[PDB]
Design an enzyme around this catalytic site. Structure first.
Site, PDB file in Angstrom:
ATOM      1  CB  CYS A  60      34.453   0.369 -47.585  1.00  0.00           C
ATOM      2  SG  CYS A  60      35.660   0.102 -48.907  1.00  0.00           S
ATOM      3  CB  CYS A  65      36.355  -2.672 -47.931  1.00  0.00           C
ATOM      4  SG  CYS A  65      37.106  -1.060 -48.030  1.00  0.00           S
TER       5      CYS A  65
END
Length: 106
Positions: free
Chosen positions: A31, A34
């Protein structure tokens, strides 16, 4: 260092039964946004020491918890106070913005 590393099995005691505000980052290695916010969390953890505890849950190693909160995408930050969600934030943001988000709920 000061970031609690969560698991599905540690979540209840580390988050729901904890004292004071807890920011939880739901994330995964694949991600992009992230990874973009990962270092800001380390800095926030040191800086808000005593007022807030910062914690991470990797959703690949720990697939149980995310669904209990209807989390649709990552990263998602949940702010817990006394075992209940107080505020959430979906998607990346800056350090400055994250401070604004926490000041708004503390």
């Amino acid at each position: 260092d000061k970031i609690i590393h969560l698991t599905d099995d540690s979540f209840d005691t580390d988050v729901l039964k904890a004292d004071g505000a807890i920011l939880v980052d739901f994330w995964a290695e694949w991600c992009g946004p992230c990874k973009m916010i990962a270092p800001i969390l380390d800095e926030i953890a040191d800086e808000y020491q005593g007022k807030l505890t910062v914690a991470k849950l990797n959703i690949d190693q720990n697939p149980g918890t995310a669904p209990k909160y209807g989390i649709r995408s990552i990263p998602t930050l949940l702010l817990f106070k006394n075992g209940e969600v107080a505020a959430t934030k979906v998607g990346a943001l800056s350090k400055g913005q994250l401070k604004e988000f926490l000041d708004a709920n503390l």
